[PDB]
Amino acid sequence: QRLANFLVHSGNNFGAILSSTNVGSNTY
Amino acid sequence: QRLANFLVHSGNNFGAILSSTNVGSNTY
Amino acid sequence: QRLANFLVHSGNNFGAILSSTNVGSNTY
Amino acid sequence: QRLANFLVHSGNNFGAILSSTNVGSNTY
Amino acid sequence: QRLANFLVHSGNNFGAILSSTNVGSNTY
Amino acid sequence: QRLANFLVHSGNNFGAILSSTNVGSNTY
Amino acid sequence: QRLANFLVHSGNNFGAILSSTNVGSNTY
Amino acid sequence: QRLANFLVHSGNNFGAILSSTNVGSNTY
Amino acid sequence: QRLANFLVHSGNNFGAILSSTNVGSNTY
Amino acid sequence: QRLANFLVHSGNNFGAILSSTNVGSNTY
Known part of the structure; x- marks a missing residue:
């Protein structure tokens, strides 16, 4: 099918390749 | 099918390639 | 089909290529 | 099927390749 | 199936390859 | 000022309230 | 100032309140 | 200032309150 | 300042309160 | 300053309060 x-x-490579990156970096 | x-x-590469990146960076 | x-x-590459990027950057 | x-x-490689990276980096 | x-x-390799990395780095 | x-x-509450939510849900 | x-x-509460949530849920 | x-x-509370949550849930 | x-x-409390939670849950 | x-x-309390929790739960 797929x-x-x-x-x-x-x-x-200094970034993301075929990747999934999550960064909060929130401020309260 | 697909x-x-x-x-x-x-x-x-300094960014994203075939990637999914999420950045909050919120401020409260 | 597809x-x-x-x-x-x-x-x-300093940006996004074949990628999906989400940035909040909200302010409250 | 898939x-x-x-x-x-x-x-x-200095970043992520076929990886899933999570970084909090929150501030309270 | 898959x-x-x-x-x-x-x-x-200085980063992650086929890996899952989690970093808190929170501040209170 | 602000x-x-x-x-x-x-x-x-089943959704988001005063929140910032990001969902990739991409398909390749 | 602010x-x-x-x-x-x-x-x-079953969702997010004053929170920042990130969900990849990508498919390759 | 702030x-x-x-x-x-x-x-x-079954969700997130004043929190930062990250979920990969990727599939390869 | 802040x-x-x-x-x-x-x-x-069954979830997160003033917390930072990371869950991989990736599949290869 | 801060x-x-x-x-x-x-x-x-059955979850996290003022905590930082990391769970891999990856599958290969």
Whole structure:
């Protein structure tokens, strides 16, 4: 039913790649 | 039913690539 | 039924590419 | 039903790759 | 039902790869 | 400069009240 | 400069009140 | 500079109150 | 500079109150 | 610079109060 192909070429990674990132950084 | 092909070429990554990022950064 | 081909060439990435980003940044 | 192929080529990784990262960083 | 193939090539890893990382870093 | 008064009366709460909620729910 | 008064009356709470909630729920 | 007063009255709490909650729940 | 007053009245607590909770619950 | 007053009244606590909780619960 569902098919997916992923091909990634990264030289230098400082962020997110195929990732899920959560940052609160709230202030009260 | 659903087919998807992904091909990404990144040299330097400082952000998000194929990612899901959440940032609150709320203030009360 | 649904077919999709993605080909991306990025040199330097500081933002979002094929991503979903959410930022609150609310103020109360 | 669901099929997925992942192929990643990373030279230097300082962030997240195929990962799930959570950071509170809240302030009260 | 569910099939997944993972192939990762990392040279130097300073972050997370196929990982789940949690960091509080809260302040009261 | 900025002044704000909040007064909320809730009987039963199943959603968000004075909150900031983020839901990805993306599909690739 | 900034002043804020919060007064909340909740009977039964099943959601978020004065909170910041993040849910990935992504699918690859 | 910044002043904030919080007063909360909860009878039964099943969710989040003045909290920051992060849930991955990702699928690969 | 920053001042904050918190007053919470809870009868029965099954969730989070003035807390920071992180749950991976990822699937590969 | 930073001042914070916390006053909490709990009858029965089954969750987190002024706490930081981390739960992996990942699956591979």
